[PDB]
Amino acid sequence: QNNQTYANYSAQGQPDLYPETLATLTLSFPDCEHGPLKNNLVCDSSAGYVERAQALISLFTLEELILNTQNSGPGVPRLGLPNYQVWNEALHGLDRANFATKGGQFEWATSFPMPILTTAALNRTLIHQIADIISTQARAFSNSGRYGLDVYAPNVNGFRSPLWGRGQETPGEDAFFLSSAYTYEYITGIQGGVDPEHLKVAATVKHFAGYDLENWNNQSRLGFDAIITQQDLSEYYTPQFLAAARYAKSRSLMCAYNSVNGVPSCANSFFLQTLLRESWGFPEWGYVSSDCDAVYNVFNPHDYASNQSSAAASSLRAGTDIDCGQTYPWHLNESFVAGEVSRGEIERSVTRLYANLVRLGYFDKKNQYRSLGWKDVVKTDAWNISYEAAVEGIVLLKNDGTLPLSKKVRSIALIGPWANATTQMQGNYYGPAPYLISPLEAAKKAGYHVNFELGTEIAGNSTTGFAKAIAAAKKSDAIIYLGGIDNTIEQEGADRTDIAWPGNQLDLIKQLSEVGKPLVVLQMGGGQVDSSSLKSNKKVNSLVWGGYPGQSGGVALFDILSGKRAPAGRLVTTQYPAEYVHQFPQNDMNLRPDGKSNPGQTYIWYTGKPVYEFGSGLFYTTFKETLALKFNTSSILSAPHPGYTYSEQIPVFTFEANIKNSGKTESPYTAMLFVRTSNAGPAPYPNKWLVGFDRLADIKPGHSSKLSIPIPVSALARVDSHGNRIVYPGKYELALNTDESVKLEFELVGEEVTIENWPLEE
Amino acid sequence: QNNQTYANYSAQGQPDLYPETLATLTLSFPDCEHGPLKNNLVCDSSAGYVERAQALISLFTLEELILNTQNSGPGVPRLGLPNYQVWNEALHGLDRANFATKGGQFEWATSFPMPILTTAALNRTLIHQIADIISTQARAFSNSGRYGLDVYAPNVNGFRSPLWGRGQETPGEDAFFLSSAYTYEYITGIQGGVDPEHLKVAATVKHFAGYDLENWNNQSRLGFDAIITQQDLSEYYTPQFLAAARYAKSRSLMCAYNSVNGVPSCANSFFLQTLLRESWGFPEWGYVSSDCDAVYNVFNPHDYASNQSSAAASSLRAGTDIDCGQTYPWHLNESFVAGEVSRGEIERSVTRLYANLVRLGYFDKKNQYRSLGWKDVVKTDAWNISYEAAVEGIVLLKNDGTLPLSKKVRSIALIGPWANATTQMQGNYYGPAPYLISPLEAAKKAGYHVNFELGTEIAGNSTTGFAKAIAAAKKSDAIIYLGGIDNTIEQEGADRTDIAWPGNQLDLIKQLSEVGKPLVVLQMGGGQVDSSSLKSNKKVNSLVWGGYPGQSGGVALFDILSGKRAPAGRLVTTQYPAEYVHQFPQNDMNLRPDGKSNPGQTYIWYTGKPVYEFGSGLFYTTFKETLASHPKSLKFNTSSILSAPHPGYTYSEQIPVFTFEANIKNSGKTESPYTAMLFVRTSNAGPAPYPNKWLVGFDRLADIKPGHSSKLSIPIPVSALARVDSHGNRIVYPGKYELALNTDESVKLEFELVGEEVTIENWPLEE
Ligand SMILES: *[C@@H]1O[C@H](CO)[C@@H](O[C@@H]2O[C@H](CO)[C@@H](O[C@@H]3O[C@H](CO)[C@@H](O)[C@H](O[C@H]4O[C@H](CO)[C@@H](O)[C@H](O)[C@@H]4O[C@H]4O[C@H](CO)[C@@H](O)[C@H](O)[C@@H]4O)[C@@H]3O)[C@H](O)[C@H]2NC(C)=O)[C@H](O)[C@H]1NC(C)=O
Ligand SMILES: *[C@@H]1O[C@H](CO)[C@@H](O[C@@H]2O[C@H](CO)[C@@H](O[C@@H]3O[C@H](CO)[C@@H](O)[C@H](O[C@H]4O[C@H](CO)[C@@H](O)[C@H](O)[C@@H]4O)[C@@H]3O)[C@H](O)[C@H]2NC(C)=O)[C@H](O)[C@H]1NC(C)=O
Ligand SMILES: *[C@@H]1O[C@H](CO)[C@@H](O[C@@H]2O[C@H](CO)[C@@H](O[C@@H]3O[C@H](CO)[C@@H](O)[C@H](O)[C@@H]3O)[C@H](O)[C@H]2NC(C)=O)[C@H](O)[C@H]1NC(C)=O
Ligand SMILES: *[C@@H]1O[C@H](CO)[C@@H](O[C@@H]2O[C@H](CO)[C@@H](O)[C@H](O)[C@H]2NC(C)=O)[C@H](O)[C@H]1NC(C)=O
Ligand SMILES: *[C@@H]1O[C@H](CO)[C@@H](O[C@@H]2O[C@H](CO)[C@@H](O)[C@H](O)[C@H]2NC(C)=O)[C@H](O)[C@H]1NC(C)=O
Ligand SMILES: *[C@@H]1O[C@H](CO)[C@@H](O[C@@H]2O[C@H](CO)[C@@H](O)[C@H](O)[C@H]2NC(C)=O)[C@H](O)[C@H]1NC(C)=O
Ligand SMILES: *[C@@H]1O[C@H](CO)[C@@H](O[C@@H]2O[C@H](CO)[C@@H](O)[C@H](O)[C@H]2NC(C)=O)[C@H](O)[C@H]1NC(C)=O
Ligand SMILES: *[C@@H]1O[C@H](CO)[C@@H](O[C@@H]2O[C@H](CO)[C@@H](O)[C@H](O)[C@H]2NC(C)=O)[C@H](O)[C@H]1NC(C)=O
Ligand SMILES: O[C@@H]1[C@@H](O)[C@H](S[C@@H]2CO[C@H](O)[C@H](O)[C@H]2O)OC[C@H]1O
Ligand SMILES: O[C@@H]1[C@@H](O)[C@H](S[C@@H]2CO[C@H](O)[C@H](O)[C@H]2O)OC[C@H]1O
Ligand SMILES: *[C@@H]1O[C@H](CO)[C@@H](O)[C@H](O)[C@H]1NC(C)=O
Ligand SMILES: *[C@@H]1O[C@H](CO)[C@@H](O)[C@H](O)[C@H]1NC(C)=O
Ligand SMILES: *[C@@H]1O[C@H](CO)[C@@H](O)[C@H](O)[C@H]1NC(C)=O
Ligand SMILES: *[C@@H]1O[C@H](CO)[C@@H](O)[C@H](O)[C@H]1NC(C)=O
Ligand SMILES: *[C@@H]1O[C@H](CO)[C@@H](O)[C@H](O)[C@H]1NC(C)=O
Ligand SMILES: *[C@@H]1O[C@H](CO)[C@@H](O)[C@H](O)[C@H]1NC(C)=O
Ligand SMILES: *[C@@H]1O[C@H](CO)[C@@H](O)[C@H](O)[C@H]1NC(C)=O
Ligand SMILES: *[C@@H]1O[C@H](CO)[C@@H](O)[C@H](O)[C@H]1NC(C)=O
Ligand SMILES: *[C@@H]1O[C@H](CO)[C@@H](O)[C@H](O)[C@H]1NC(C)=O
Ligand SMILES: *[C@@H]1O[C@H](CO)[C@@H](O)[C@H](O)[C@H]1NC(C)=O
Ligand SMILES: [Zn+2]
Ligand SMILES: [Zn+2]
Ligand SMILES: [Zn+2]
Ligand SMILES: [Zn+2]
Ligand SMILES: [Zn+2]
Ligand SMILES: [Zn+2]
Ligand SMILES: [Zn+2]
Ligand SMILES: [Zn+2]
Ligand SMILES: [Zn+2]
Ligand SMILES: [Zn+2]
Ligand SMILES: [Zn+2]
Ligand SMILES: [Zn+2]
């Protein structure tokens, strides 16, 4: 929008936003005791939140309303109503806050791992606590005018194509179960419960819908039209958004840049009204924000409207309340002049935003959360849950017992473009951290003699660092290589073009494997890289996926390597063979194989052979898993469901298995539970789908902990050609983990039961 | 549905409901301190109303949920959740209550005038207070297990065709302003404010939409398919429902028997979702009830569904939550089995009902409204607002000085089928009253020597009774004829076939007028009758429309006639000439004239000559009305006016463009209250055809003494000036306009709207 020369937004992965959109404001609170609003109902803390917001909005001029439909809202100075920023980032810690540059206060926020790694821990409580800490820290910054009260998080789009530059931000490729679980735990942690009366921080689930690529084939997200079947819409692209609106009661949602089936998400009333509000129960006075700036893109380049005034009017009427950008505040005045919108439609949007602000305690100084301050940031950071998430999430992919490093290992050769990682560990959308503990520093602090060599860059074709690296290796007890990808390779605005290890890193690892010494390789980054050559190289003793480990990253990794903590992470996306992305266009949105070039996408549908499967992860011990069957769903759904708000949440039954530590190392345990069928519902039939997961606390050798995995009605439902979610009678089989240590056959009997009726598109 | 022999519901005006639907339950409240629910969140009075309702519903079996989608909900005995009745009538007082038959308490409730007469008073405060009394009495009965907490009221369909058997129930023919005003005052009075946290009684605005006939031409409402333009739908058939949902925040709404443009109202997602929820902000956890039993009629006779299971599914999915009938509770089980509905869809609807019950204090014994009792019925009844409404509403149509009856009038010949009226005064949907004061008992109480003769029946065809009535007239100082129509003529389930005085009443009136005595005619009933021959007969000294005056009807009538009170009512429908209904089909839903059979419908569009016009009414005095002041500029810029702050108004379209102000001087012999209707017209603003005029305001002023003046101030809201385009959009158009005060047009004021067109409402596309 703010381009200086011609800009092809069908190709360019990044918009050109106005400085106003991108500005860092200084925030504050209305003075309800002495200010101009003191006798208005909005300042009456005993009144209803809607009635309060309505009373306030009645005081605005038309132009004031319009200006306050943008993310950087100017407020209304004459009313003592301060500017308010809607665009705040919280993906895995505070970002876009007005951080102090000196003074020892508000200089930083806790930098948790990227969600990709945190989700690999398979721990729901963990996700929830991270969210709670983030929203405590948000309130603290807010109380000093340095952060808003709503957050553009979480990013829960399915990591469908492995080359997506933003998959790192997500809880993985399983939109239906794993992502939805993350969605619920994160949003309830941000918001302080399930639609509590006193909202903590408003979540903004994103990006709705069909957004999972930046610019593959030079087709920008900004102009992309996702051709998606109704079946896939219901099955893969929206179930996490149903979870957000229905179960978590997210106060906000962000509509995506792209179109779906010819309709821009932000101008899509089927999306924003029929689905979001009428099918999934999105809060009445919840509000929708556009992406930055998806309203502009309705016009340029989507051409769904002919100018900015019309793009504004179409988005507003479809259900987009707040524009991250300048199209609303600078063109809705034209929309009004042209009769395209009423003042009613504009007031509703602003009223929605302020209704949430009222709920958030914006006008109530005595509100419980208005007293959080810097010491609460200090205290929650000192809990070291960022370290804990990283430690629980790290994935051991290959190991011959070389890990944990034996007491005999005294010197290490520390090699690779991730060996001295600091800011690399933070991924993206991060603010300043209190500290960043590199793998190098953590290695020294662990008490190893460290021979550090860069060896080679992430993406270089230079070998001039090889010799010194081999030299450092030849004079060390073990080699620890840390490499892979980072945000120079995968980023917002630019997808990868391939999913192989970048540069000449694999050559360096090969030459290191032929040194004669034990070799541990840490594959870092969010997306996966093809590590088949490492899998098949016997001289590569150990392979670890370390994701983006956050502020205490080095210590988390080296506590795992040294065996202080025992790894238990599992992959939350498939590591595909490198040729996968060359086999079919990556913006083919069809999940199922087509018998042509599309081989099936994700662990659910892929007919090929993953290098490492979704759900791969090894332990420092061995476990012995043992089991501890005609179900009539219609009957099961006929019963009372105390403890569950929605009927589809009830277990069909609970999978019970004993988990014995048959080895000789204390270890926590993780499990994914999969189901499959070859006769229930329509063909084609999936490989399998995830229906449950859990993490159990450290189990001692000889001890047995019980794994209980409820199998909800919603999880056994399949999706028909119309998008309906229906539980079908037939034969199913559970399988525990990728190793399928335990399997359980059961039959579903009775008639088909409808779980959701998918509505017709407009 | 419960017919014993073949029933043709395309023709038959009344359904055959199962006894279960019609049953009189004994109600009670759950014990939230000690009962099975005490630890459930529903019994936590500090929790959110939605969360409370969700916690309760979670405890139900599927069958218990299904069974509690009917109006006579059985509750859940094992949970200590009592049966609850959704079908409670309150149109003009409590009805379908479990009235006691002995013991001196709860044997009766106040019987107000039918809303048609109440509305004629043009008094907003009156309507609101009536509604407040009704809801106080509702809660009092509720607290003794004798009534529910939601009411199937108000009926606010525009009384469009004059032969409608139920137009009597409505605030008249002006859907946009007059009916919408009644809707607001009544619903907020019923509900105890504007969506208050503590709801007093849930209102159910009805009937949505296109419903304004019972069985004209033997086409029953049960199978009627209204063909209505989007323009008419926005302009005439729905504005009162926008008002109910948006301004009044009605907690419930009732969907109609009929289809509109091929889609039954209760299976109509455009109506129940797109318009109701997305356009007008109907409460998120408000609920929709069908009419009794419109869900059944989706199948039989509409054939929109092939069976009851499919009819239930379609109605539920479209947005109908509660069935007045047994289609839901006895066939949603089948819908579920067939995969047509989810348990989620069923749960939402029951949760919706119980969310309102939570808000109504159904689970909180300490709720403000849970202590109201029989003494509160006695107290509110004794205020005599029923009497007051009738006396305010009575309309003086014709007079030469005969009314009020002079002191010279000692004896009266009281003639007519309405002369000894008791139950006739109650109209329809009435429960037992404390008493009923007939016009006969009232005349005797007031001190006149009364010579009473029936004369003829309402629909009588014999002249045998004439002679005694004529003899009585000859002995008396004045003749007071009371007749017209009643509920043997106009009723639920059966429209009138014509709009003339029934039977030989006019022939009797003619002969009474040949006697040579002063003659006063009281024209009773809700619908109008063609009184043109009474209008032109110089020996009919006076004509009064008395509507259905309720429990103290006789005293209201004779206090007016005696001059103890002075009349100020104005007609709220057009009194058409009898020919009107025989010129064009009465199910032609187009308001505009078409240059063929349709002369235009209502005072807004009618091109013929009313016998008495909408807004007709005379006083016991005369008034001089003069423009008080106008804004310096009479060129109003709507876009600019709407751009300003609007403190004191929730919605921008509610702000005044300006205020019409007049001085009202009593220029006669007698102290009198005053009423005014304010009309606007345009010859160039908006699209053609241009209407006659349309109502934009009204008011009633307190007694004005001879020679004294009072101020009349009538704001002109932006919404009132908006016109409707061919697509249903509400747009304020620039151009020339003229206000006219009353039917006599005593004051007129030209103004101009300048600047661009302004969109007030975008009418959504149908599905
Ligand atoms: C203001 O409010 C007050 C308080 O409510 C009103 O006062 C009440 O007024 C009514 C009506 O006048 C009065 O009820 C009558 O009481 C009489 C003595 O107790 C009764 O004899 C009379 O009974 C007749 O009506 C019954 C209906 O239930 C019939 O069933 C019964 O058969 C009686 O009818 C006989 O008599 C009538 C004429 O008298 C005759 O036509 C019949 O054929 C039959 O022979 C009434 O019940 C109350 O007692 C008053 N209550 C109090 C507390 O004072 C007052 O009316 C209000 N004012 C206005 C203007 O509305
Ligand atoms: C699934 O995730 C949950 C939630 O994160 C996790 O439970 C958590 O475990 C951590 C780690 O033990 C707990 O963190 C501690 O909490 C107390 C507060 O009660 C703090 O005092 C502790 O801080 C000190 O100790 C740290 C570690 O020794 C030091 O680094 C630090 O500087 C402090 O001195 C510490 O933060 C946390 O309390 C729980 N959280 C909850 C909600 O229970 C659980 O273990 C995971 N489950 C499985 C099976 O893995
Ligand atoms: C558990 O939480 C504590 C408290 O936040 C962490 O302690 C902190 O560790 C960092 C990194 O080593 C220290 O920062 C460093 O401090 C030195 C000296 O002041 C400075 O020269 C370095 O540049 C660096 O900033 C920090 O001082 C220390 N803070 C406290 C209060 O002890 C600890 O790291 C956490 N544990 C894990 C495993 O993450
Ligand atoms: C709609 O609003 C925009 C933004 O306020 C207007 O554009 C501004 O016009 C003013 C006055 O001419 C200039 O001084 C500003 O520099 C413009 N601002 C921006 C951000 O472009 C626009 O003119 C308005 N349109 C109408 C019809 O009122
Ligand atoms: C590892 O990275 C750290 C941090 O980026 C490097 O530390 C810097 O070292 C220079 C002196 O050589 C100091 O002046 C800077 O203040 C340090 N930077 C920061 C951000 O603290 C360190 O050199 C790197 N180690 C290597 C390359 O072996
Ligand atoms: C309009 O109706 C109101 C409400 O019923 C009338 O005010 C009532 O008048 C009666 C009889 O004088 C009193 O007993 C009530 O207490 C009054 N009620 C209230 C709420 O004030 C009012 O007189 C009518 N207005 C006009 C102008 O005739
Ligand atoms: C759905 O529910 C209705 C109401 O309970 C069932 O109708 C009853 O069926 C029994 C046995 O068929 C009959 O004896 C009764 O006459 C019916 N009762 C009533 C009140 O009508 C119906 O069977 C159920 N259908 C299904 C498929 O479960
Ligand atoms: C006017 O109507 C009243 C009420 O219906 C009549 O009162 C009834 O008259 C009969 C016979 O006289 C009595 O036995 C009943 O008890 C009365 N019923 C009630 C409810 O009061 C009255 O007779 C009628 N008057 C005339 C003159 O026809
Ligand atoms: O998740 C969304 C992102 O989609 C956008 S991306 C945005 C593009 O425009 C500039 O380059 C911005 O710096 C960049 O963040 O940002 C908002 C997030 O919440
Ligand atoms: O306003 C509605 C009415 O339309 C229905 S009509 C109903 C038809 O079936 C029986 O005869 C009943 O006695 C009659 O009321 O009733 C409910 C009202 O609220
Ligand atoms: C910006 O790019 C658009 C096309 O996206 C083009 O129409 C316009 O001319 C450009 N603006 C400027 C100032 O170059
Ligand atoms: C803009 O980019 C699109 C997609 O990459 C491409 O098809 C088109 O040729 C480009 N248009 C211009 C004018 O360069
Ligand atoms: C995308 O565009 C750039 C030119 O800016 C080009 O270097 C690159 O080869 C293109 N990629 C594809 C797949 O066409
Ligand atoms: C803007 O675009 C709309 C269509 O999206 C069109 O109807 C309107 O006339 C356009 N206005 C101007 C000023 O070009
Ligand atoms: C399943 O349950 C339903 C309802 O409980 C029952 O009607 C049906 O007969 C059962 N069918 C089987 C095969 O168990
Ligand atoms: C009731 O009427 C329907 C048609 O409306 C007819 O099919 C049926 O025979 C009747 N039922 C009975 C029991 O007479
Ligand atoms: C039912 O009534 C309709 C309309 O009055 C008529 O067309 C039809 O012939 C009747 N059907 C039967 C079976 O009598
Ligand atoms: C009921 O009618 C519907 C059509 O509305 C049809 O699809 C369904 O199969 C019918 N069910 C039965 C049991 O006949
Ligand atoms: C009056 O009506 C009755 C019953 O309908 C009938 O027997 C009689 O013939 C009618 N008489 C006249 C004069 O219309
Ligand atoms: C009406 O007001 C609008 C908004 O202030 C302004 O743009 C326009 O010029 C005005 N038009 C007239 C005719 O006064
Ligand atoms: Zn003070
Ligand atoms: Zn102050
Ligand atoms: Zn919590
Ligand atoms: Zn509180
Ligand atoms: Zn513009
Ligand atoms: Zn008790
Ligand atoms: Zn009130
Ligand atoms: Zn309260
Ligand atoms: Zn049929
Ligand atoms: Zn039909
Ligand atoms: Zn059936
Ligand atoms: Zn005729």
Automatic annotation (TrEMBL), chain A:
Source organism (scientific name) = Hypocrea jecorina
Q: Example GO biological process term? A: xylan catabolic process
One GO term in the molecular function aspect is: metal ion binding
Annotated residues for binding of Zn(2+) 4 = 128
**Catalyzes what?**
Hydrolysis of (1->4)-beta-D-xylans, to remove successive D-xylose residues from the non-reducing termini
Q: Which UniProt keywords apply?
A: Carbohydrate metabolism, Glycoprotein, Glycosidase, Hydrolase, Metal-binding, Polysaccharide degradation, Pyrrolidone carboxylic acid, Secreted, Signal, Xylan degradation, Zinc
Q: Which residues are glycosylated?
A: 3, 8, 218, 307, 461, 632
**EC code(s) of this entry:** 3.2.1.37
Residues that, per the record, bind Zn(2+) 7: 198
Query: Where is Zn(2+) 10 annotated to bind?
Result: 331, 334
The highest taxon in the source lineage is Eukaryota
Recorded protein name is xylan 1,4-beta-xylosidase
Binding-site residues for Zn(2+) 13, renumbered to this chain: 666
Gene Ontology CC: extracellular region
Query: Do the record's keywords include Oxidoreductase?
Result: no
- Pathway assignment: Glycan degradation; xylan degradation
List of residues binding Zn(2+) 12: 582
